[PDB]
Amino acid sequence: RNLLNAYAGPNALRDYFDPDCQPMIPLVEIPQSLNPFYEDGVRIHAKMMSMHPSNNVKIMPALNMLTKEVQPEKSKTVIEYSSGSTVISLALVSRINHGINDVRAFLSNKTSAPKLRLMQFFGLDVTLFGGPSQPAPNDERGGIYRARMMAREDEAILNVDQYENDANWQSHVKWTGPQIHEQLPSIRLICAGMGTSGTMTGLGQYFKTAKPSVFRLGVCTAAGDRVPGPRSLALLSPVEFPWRDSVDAIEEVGSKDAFTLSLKLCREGLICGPSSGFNLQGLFNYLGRLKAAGTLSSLAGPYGIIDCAFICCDLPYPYVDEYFDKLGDNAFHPIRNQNLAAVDLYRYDEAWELEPSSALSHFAVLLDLRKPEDFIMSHIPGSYNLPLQSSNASTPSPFTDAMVLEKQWKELEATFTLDRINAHDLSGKDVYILCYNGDTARVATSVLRAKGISASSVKGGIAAVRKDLPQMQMA
Amino acid sequence: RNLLNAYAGPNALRDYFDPDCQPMIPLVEIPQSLNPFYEDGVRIHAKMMSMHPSNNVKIMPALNMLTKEVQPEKSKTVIEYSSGSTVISLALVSRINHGINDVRAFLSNKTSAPKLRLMQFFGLDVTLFGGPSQPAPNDERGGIYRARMMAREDEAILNVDQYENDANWQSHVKWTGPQIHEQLPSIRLICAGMGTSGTMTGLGQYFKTAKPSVFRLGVCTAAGDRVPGPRSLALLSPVEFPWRDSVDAIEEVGSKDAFTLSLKLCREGLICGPSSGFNLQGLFNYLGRLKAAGTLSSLAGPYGIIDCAFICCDLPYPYVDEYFDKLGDNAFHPIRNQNLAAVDLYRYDEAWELEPSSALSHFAVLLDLRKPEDFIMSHIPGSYNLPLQSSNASTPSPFTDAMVLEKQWKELEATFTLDRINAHDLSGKDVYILCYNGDTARVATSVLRAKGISASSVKGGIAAVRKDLPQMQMA
Amino acid sequence: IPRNLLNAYAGPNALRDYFDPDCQPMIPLVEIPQSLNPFYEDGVRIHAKMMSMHPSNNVKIMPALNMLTKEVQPEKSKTVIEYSSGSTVISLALVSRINHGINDVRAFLSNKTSAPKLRLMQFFGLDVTLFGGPSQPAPNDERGGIYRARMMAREDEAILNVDQYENDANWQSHVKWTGPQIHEQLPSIRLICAGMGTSGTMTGLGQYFKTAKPSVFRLGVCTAAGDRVPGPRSLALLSPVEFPWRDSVDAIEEVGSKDAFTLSLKLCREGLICGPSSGFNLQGLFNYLGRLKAAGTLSSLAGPIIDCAFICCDLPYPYVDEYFDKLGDNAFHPIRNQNLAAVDLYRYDEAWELEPSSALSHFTSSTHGVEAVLLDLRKPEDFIMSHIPGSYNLPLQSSNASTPSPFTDAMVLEKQWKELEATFTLDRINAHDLSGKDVYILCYNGDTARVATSVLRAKGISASSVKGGIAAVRKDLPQMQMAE
Amino acid sequence: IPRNLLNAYAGPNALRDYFDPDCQPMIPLVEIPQSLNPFYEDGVRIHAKMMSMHPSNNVKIMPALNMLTKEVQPEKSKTVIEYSSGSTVISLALVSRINHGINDVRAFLSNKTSAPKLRLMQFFGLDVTLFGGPSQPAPNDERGGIYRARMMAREDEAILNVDQYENDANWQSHVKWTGPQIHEQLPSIRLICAGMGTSGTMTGLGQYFKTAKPSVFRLGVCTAAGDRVPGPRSLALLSPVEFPWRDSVDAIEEVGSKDAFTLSLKLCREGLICGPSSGFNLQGLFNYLGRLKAAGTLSSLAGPIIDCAFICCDLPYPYVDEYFDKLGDNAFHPIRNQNLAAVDLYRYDEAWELEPSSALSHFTSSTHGVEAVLLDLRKPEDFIMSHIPGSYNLPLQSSNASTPSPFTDAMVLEKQWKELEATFTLDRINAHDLSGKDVYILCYNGDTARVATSVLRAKGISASSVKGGIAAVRKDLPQMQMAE
């Protein structure tokens, strides 16, 4: 393995993605505050497959299937139906290891728009498919069957078919398994959610021979629910992988618990996606079933601790919006001064704000935003008055009160229409804004600059020019 | 260092985030196809700070500043103004290392909504601030000044102040520097974009003493432009860090090139955010300036190769929408069958589709969606006819043609109104749908189930019942 | 002097004589009933001069006739231009063609004139030009339309502007016709009342009665300062005019618009069809009589009874919408079946309703697939039990076996017509290929089937209903008969 | 026999005698001009019976009078109910109160009756009930309103339904009045023409003239199958009625609606103000005369000239909007300044325009901060050069020193009024604290300042303008004088 984690040469990217060459995928024990069975002697370790450079667990099937199925100088296009993770990993490995840039992605039409934009981001050619979002591999109307049929014709087209290619689950027998066993020699239970079942079958078949005492717990999505990644128990019946020989028990977990635990994991420091909390909740449901039955101590080793390892599949960033939909507004701190998110949209440049000596030197027109009676009493000679209802002498600063910033910016935007700008002939000349303290003036310069007017504000407003330049006659 | 990358015990998360305990942050040489100076003997290596478990470069200042500034049993709240990355890293370290769950985030009101939702995701208390999105630390109206002033009162409130705390740039002297030098002993040039300038100052001050021959290149945002992370040269004038002694040259890069190079890096396998392409473009601009001047060979070592290292700061996932706004629709493959993204929104369950023997056994009402003249000629006795304009005998399958799926699902949704459902008394009984081939029927069962009707389809439609059940009289 | 005793006008000058106030019968004068005269017990009799009963329907025909007769130059005048509120220039257009053969009549109006009233000018063939600024400008306001109209007739020798606001022939027409008619129609007159807009009507009545029977009281009426009613004007806007109206009135009353429309509404329902300025004139008379009665000097107007005459200026038909805006829901009976006003919008033909034997014969004569279809709107289970072979079942939740006729219950017709419109979308019409075929509608009720024909016919579908529901064709259905 | 020679009606029965066709002058008969008679050269004279000139304004007053006189039972009849298209039940309400003191008149109408016509029934005090189904149902259609109205009078002893569709007193009223009047008004009559809705008018004219002068041709007019005009009906819907209309007509013409409105529009502009069914009747006469003239048998109608009389049924005022929908842009003069119809919506008072010395004295008398403000609408640089001390500068791009008066250019008024409305938002009104103060407007032009006063006054701001622009106050500004 690369001890320095430094990769150079013409094959740096190849070795960087190589599971045997890179450091082993991190295995981190979760904190005690998140483990409700800690006092019972249960230790839960998270295999952060999201910490692979590809950021998803699908890089192991993708690496193994492409190495096995691709034909040199005979494969020019890769097609695959996926829920997102596999086709991203295929897109990267096809270019890094096989020099193939034509990767076509088949996804359900009901997949979220952020998930869809992420597919285009990685250079994928996406085709949407109606009907079931998770079609059976033998459904002739689903993308899995269509991708496999498009690969039989045009021999350059390759469909590795993650749903029924043995190289899928064999990748976890080759890498994911032999890492957890060495990282956790005292492992008593391995847990993984089943999408294609490749992860769980690989882990289950490996631990079937290596340390047969390890309990193998699979997690499926509850009937009628949906979690990105795994599938329901009904959708796992037709699959031909030996998952029935790779599991010792099955748990069913819903989507609300999955997103809840995923959120709890990310704030602890283990940044992982919804299916990771899905897998952890499945482990919680089984551990509580033995504790309720009093048989939890049967999984313990010579020392009373029970070492459990569960898979964390990907990062939660593409799913962040789904958390707010599935979970309530609780467990999310509301945004303070939320109204500002749509009422101060334009940029501010510190070069627009000038000292009174610098502004009056150029004098080009000068605009005064104070009240008309305050303007009559005293103002800079030669300046135009343009009052505002939201701004008087006693008005608090815009940047100290969220509402008056909402009022002043709106009134400034509504005041500087195309007719009023030409009414003062502001177009094509340097405009200087004057205020009481300069804060309203700086908000005004952010409105005018976005409209093409070369506006500038005087820091301190009329209060600064009187003290900095006492000799200038107000009149 | 943890050779196995396995972390157990009560301090597993602490050691997992520890830069000295974890494996060194990966340093990967970029492919030749992305290096336009490869033939000139230039080798560019990417320091993937995004590969830290916190996924951003700000974990080094956050770790170092919190260790230095926090007071045990005296600090209960952490407040900080940031562009996003720092306050995420502060939120995690405050809980992992200091048991502080009250972290308040000050951000500009003009930061994108996905970036804002990510702040709430990590458990942050966000306050929006108007005015400049990147305020000067001495701007009394900006969040940097306000956070520092709120920390002087209520001594439990802590503001580490990344913009003027020396522990910021010192963190990269302690970790980021001593890793790149060991990972790349032949390094000739180090490159980093300057936001708080902590990364570049740390790298510049370290290489100032360790291997003084290394050229130190800083990158700033072009005037008037904006890149998430770095700042402009104008905003770096007032900062008190010794960045002017840590750089040997300055480059200015715009936002379009930043997002373009970041996109090119992600598809190569180096998944990093916009500021990473921003830093790489700065290196390209300086290398091309020496090649145009013919002085590029002055940076070469004994062997003709020039080893350059540049920082990759974070992941591009929170910025994915900004790529489509900044970059054109080119370099993005358009979504095929895009119309399906809003015209087949409801789920399909394989249990709803039944064989003809299973459906006619229950018979509860039976619905036939064929044309009325096709229904008159032959239909299942006892069934109601409900024709559709978008479906006749010659109509292609919905799942084979995107437009007819758009037509049939719409007509089905428009047909099964509340009045028509009660007109056929479909409420409270098992409804079975009949079609020509069963495809339109399965689209109909996805419309009715979402409306509360326990609908089911017959696979093969009327064509299957006649062959599977020949003895049933049609009439 | 002699008037048409047959009210029959023939020859080439039939139109000229028909509009002549000397040829035609006198403008009718009618005593209002006691139910509208609150002072009838006090001995006052109030008579209405129905100027609206002239062939032109407005009081403005008298000055239009007199001004044009005076100002027009035959063989030389070819264009008439006048600024008015609406009634004057209509009367000018009629007279310009009838008496002078002039068709180029241009109307200068305010830009704030209501859209219904603007179309009425176009209806009578007027050339309307809108003028910004005050709708009722002073005659010397050089911005207003009164001044420019007077200058365009000065600038050109062929353009004529009679100027109703400054021409003496305006009020002189009432000294010639309206006054003498009322005097002869009511010799015992003791008070004459009229509103003042141009003041022409009141100045004429006041100047004539000043010498002819000087004992008659002359009572003008002006609109209150805040109000405005069509026709007259307020006292403020009566200051610039040069007509001797102050010498024509003995007192002036101010009346609001609500009282004007209210009383004008009460006059039409009595049989005296007249517009808002008519109730405006009568209200001024009521106010002066009431103030005089409360003070006890009501006997001062009498001779030995008090006969009062007031002017009714035009018809209310152009103003109908204004009555509902200015008056309340009271004195207006609400619509009994208001909901039906937007739920049966389409027509019926009676020929669409066919006898059962006739309809079923047409459906069977034509081919069932290509030429004609039959729609059965009953429940699906009833349709399965018995139906006409070859018909399509389109059930409606609105109709049942016990549902009464939709034309006997307003809500049933509303619900049935709504569902019929909601079910017969163009997608469903094409789904059954109803386009271009003869459609026959069978239902439980049969009256519901007629509603279906109206809905289907309005879209282009040649639909027909079977008279009587499923009951009329029970003799033709053996399956239905055997289930009894 | 004797008619009111003074057209003056007094006493307690003034309304009764005013509506009496025997007391009042005969309904006028007027020969249409040659410009409207295409066969005038052939020796035909066409006369219009202006039934619209009755005090009720519609032909339906004759059957309403006769039916109620026959059917009403004094001291016993207290409610009148009738299904009609609109004109009949209005005439019933007037007669029910005038002749019988009955105010409970309920009108059964179709739900498809236009909203303007529905308000006209409420205007005359009718109780309107809408009926779904066919708007013109057969009298024996038990769903329609004709049948239920006839049964409600059968069910109750106090409810009366005269039933214009089946009562002989309908057509008998024209044997009594309309026929004899036309016969005496036109003794040489050789053809009588009228449309058929209830067929009462034509049956009456046809039955009377059948015995009185049997040589007169009787020509009915029906609406074409596809068209419909208010009043008459098509031949198809004339089948169920029991009136002897076939024995009353010698020929029947069919006329479309477009020709009806077109000819009716040509009759009003000639001075014969009449509605669409009147041009409908005249078009049927033109068609029969033209067909007869082309065949060469036009001389067959003559005696030794051909005198033809046709019925004019009502006034066009309720139908004005329909004319623009059915007719084209031709024969309608367009509005000259159409753009101004929505860009100067508010009024002016003339008192708002003050002389320069008067306005500046008011502004200086009151306190400048609390009581009054002055707005200067000139350019900012001109305001800086010279202005009234204490005034606020609100420049307008629309106005300049050389810009003409907005009331002399329609686009200038449009732009200036738009910007004035666009600049004087309630934010700007509060920003200058204009609320509750006397506002004085100074501008380059002064006429532009009046537009500002109209805009400001309509919102609640007590604004006034200085007569004359900056030129009228140049003598009061020393700085301006010294810059010359």
Output the 3-class SS for A290-334. Answer: HHHHCCHHHHCCCCCCEEEEEEECECCHHHHHHHHHHCCCCCCCC
Q: For residue D410, which of D342, D348, D337, D345 has the smallest C-alpha distance?
A: D337
Which residues in chain B are contacts of A347 at CB distance < 8 A? 110, 132-133, 226
| Cα–Cα distance, D265 to D279 (Å, whole number) | 8
Q: Which of C223, C238, C330, C340 is the best substitution to test chain D (most D C-beta atoms within 10 A)?
A: C340
Beta bridge partner(s), residue D141: none
Q: Which residues of C touch D58 (CB under 8 A)?
A: none
Return the ∠ at Cα A212 (arms to A208 and A213), rounded to 5°. 135
Report d(CA D326, CA D259) in Å as an integer: 10
Nearest chain D Cα distance for residue A373, angstroms: 7
State CA A80 to chain mean position distance. 23
In chain C, where the domains are located: 21-58+174-326, 61-160, 353-482
What tokens were used for C326? 């200015």
* Approach to solving: X-ray
Asked if the domains D20-55+171-326 and D353-482 are classified in one and the same CATH topology, the answer is: no
Nearest to A315 by CA among A345, A275, A351: A275
CB contact under 8 A, D369 and A371: no
Cα distance from N-terminal residue to C-terminal residue, chain A? 81
D245 within 8 A of D220, measured Cβ to Cβ = yes
Q: How far is CA A147 from the centre of its chain?
A: 28
Q: Do D427 and A373 touch (CB under 8 A)?
A: no
User: Which residues from chain B sit within 8 angstroms of residue C390, using beta carbons?
Assistant: 376
Residue B249's DSSP bridge partners are B217
What distances in angstroms separate CA D403 from CA D378, D398, D467, one per listed residue?
A: 12, 8, 17
Q: By the 8 A CB rule, do B240 and B279 touch? A: no
* CA–CA min distance D83, chain A (Å): 58
Say how far apart CA B349 and CA A235 lie, in whole Å: 10
Q: Is A199 annotated as a binding residue?
A: yes
Partner residue opposite D119 with nearest CB, options C24, C122, C324? C324
Q: C152, C228, C350: which to substitute to probe chain D, counting the most D Cβ within 10 Å?
A: C350
Residue B447 CB neighbour total at 10 angstroms: 23
**Token couple for D360:** 């500046």
Interface contact C130-D351, CB threshold 8 A: no
Neighbours of C, requiring at least 3 CB pairs below 8 Å, are B, D
Place of tokens 């105010």: D103
Between CA B474 and CA B370 the distance in angstroms is 14
From B35, which residue of chain A is nearest by alpha-carbon distance?
A10
> Measured in whole angstroms, how far is the alpha carbon of residue D256 from the centre of its chain?
22
| Alpha-carbon gap, residue C312 to C47, rounded angstroms | 10
Query: Which of D225, D233, D164, D228 lies closest to D194, judged by CA?
Result: D233
Whole-number Å distance between alpha carbons of D104 and B317: 79
Q: Distance, in angstroms, between D81 CA and closest chain C CA?
A: 14
Q: Name the amino acid, one letter, at B472.
A: M
Distance CA(D364)–CA(D390), nearest Å, equals: 9
Residues in CB range of B45: below 8 A, 6 or more apart: A6, A8, B27, B28, B29, B30, B183, B184, B307, B308, B309, B310
Give which of A385, A409, A418 to mutate to test D binding, by max D Cβ within 10 Å: A385
Query: What residues form DSSP beta bridges with C129?
Result: C108
**DSSP characters over B355-397:** -HHHHHHH--EEEE-S-HHHHHHS--TTPEE---TT--TTPPP
Distance CA A173, CA D13 (A): 116
Who contacts A70 (Cβ-Cβ below 8 Å, separation ≥6)?
A94, A98, A100, A158
Quick one: which H or E segment has residue A7? strand A6-7
Q: Are C90 and C124 in contact (CB under 8 A)?
A: yes
Q: Which residues contact C368 (CB under 8 A, 6 or more apart)?
A: B376, C374, C390
Q: Which fold has domain A19-55+168-326?
A: Rossmann fold (3.40.50)
Cβ proximity of B436 and B373 under 8 Å = no
Task: Measure the CA–CA gap between B167 and B93, rounded to whole angstroms.
Answer: 15
Secondary structure, 3-state, A132-201: CCCCCCCCCCCHHHHHHHHHHCCCCEECCCCCCCHHHHHHHHHHHHHHHHHHCCCEEEEEEECCCCHHHH
Helix axes C276-295, C257-270, angle to 10 degrees: 100
Residues 6+ positions from D79 with CB-CB distance below 8 Å: D102, D104, D105, D106, D156, D158, D159, D160
Phi first, then psi, for residue A442 (nearest 5°) are -70, -35
CA–CA separation, B42 and B45 (whole Å): 10
The helix (H) or strand (E) run that includes residue B431 is strand B431-434
For D226-237, b where at least 16 C-beta lie within 10 A, e where not — what string?
ebbbbbbbbeeb
The domain B21-55+171-326 having CATH identifier 3.40.50.1100: the answer here is yes
Residues D50, D32: contact at Cβ < 8 Å?
no
CB distance A126 to A118 below 8 Å:
no
For D240, name the nearest residue in chain C, comparing CA atoms only: C350
Residue C456 main-chain phi, psi, to 5 deg: -75, -35
- In terms of phi and psi (left: phi > 0; alpha: psi -120 to 50; beta: otherwise), the region of A80 is beta
Strands C189-195, B455-458: pairing is unpaired
Q: Which among B96, B333, B335 has CB closest to A269?
A: B96
CA–CA gap between residue B14 and residue B24 (Å, rounded): 16
What are chain A's partners, defined as 3 or more CB pairs within 8 angstroms?
B, D
Cβ distance A337 to B129 less than 8 Å, yes or no, reads yes
User: What class, spelled out in words, does domain D61-160 have in CATH?
Assistant: alpha beta
Helix, strand or coil, per DSSP, at residue D83:
strand
Angstroms from D106 CA to nearest CA on chain A: 56
- D457, D463 contact by CB (below 8 A): yes
Contacts of A209 (CB under 8 A, 6+ apart): none
CA distance linking residue B383 with residue B360, whole number of Å: 11
User: How far is C106 from C103, CA to CA, in rounded Å?
Assistant: 9
| B229 backbone φψ class: left, alpha, beta (φ>0; ψ -120 to 50) | left
Contact of D276 with D338, CB cutoff 8 Å: no
Asked whether B and D share 3 or more beta-carbon pairs under 8 angstroms, the answer is no
Cα(D263)–Cα(D203) distance, rounded to whole angstroms? 24
- CATH of C353-482 among 3.40.50.10490, 3.40.50.880, 3.40.250.10, 3.30.70.1400: 3.40.250.10
Report the Cα D106 to chain-centroid distance in Å.
24
- C-alpha span between D406 and D355 (Å, rounded): 20
CATH code of C21-58+174-326, in short, is 3.40.50.1100
Give domain B341-468's CATH superfamily.
Answer: Rhodanese-like domain (3.40.250.10)
R_g (Cα) of chain A, nearest Å? 32
Q: How far apart, in whole angstroms, are the C-alpha atoms of residue D440 and residue D354?
A: 9
Neighboring chain B residues of A338 at a CB cutoff of 8 Å: 128
Chain D residues within an 8 Å CB radius of A415 = 427-428
Q: With contact defined as beta carbons under 8 Å apart, do A183 and B4 qualify?
A: yes
Nearest Cβ partner for A26 among B16, B126, B316: B16
Q: Which CATH architecture has domain D20-55+171-326?
A: 3-Layer(aba) Sandwich (3.40)
Domain A59-158 class, CATH top level: alpha beta
Q: B318 is written with which tokens?
A: 């929170």
CA dihedral D31, D34, D37, D42 (to 10 degrees): 100
Contact D56, D19 (CB under 8 A): yes
Looking at residue B189, its amino acid is: L
Backbone angles phi, psi at D229, to 5 degrees: -130, 150
Q: What's the token pair of residue B115?
A: 């970036």
Cβ-contact A240, A270 below 8 angstroms: no
Distance CA D296, CA A176 (A): 111
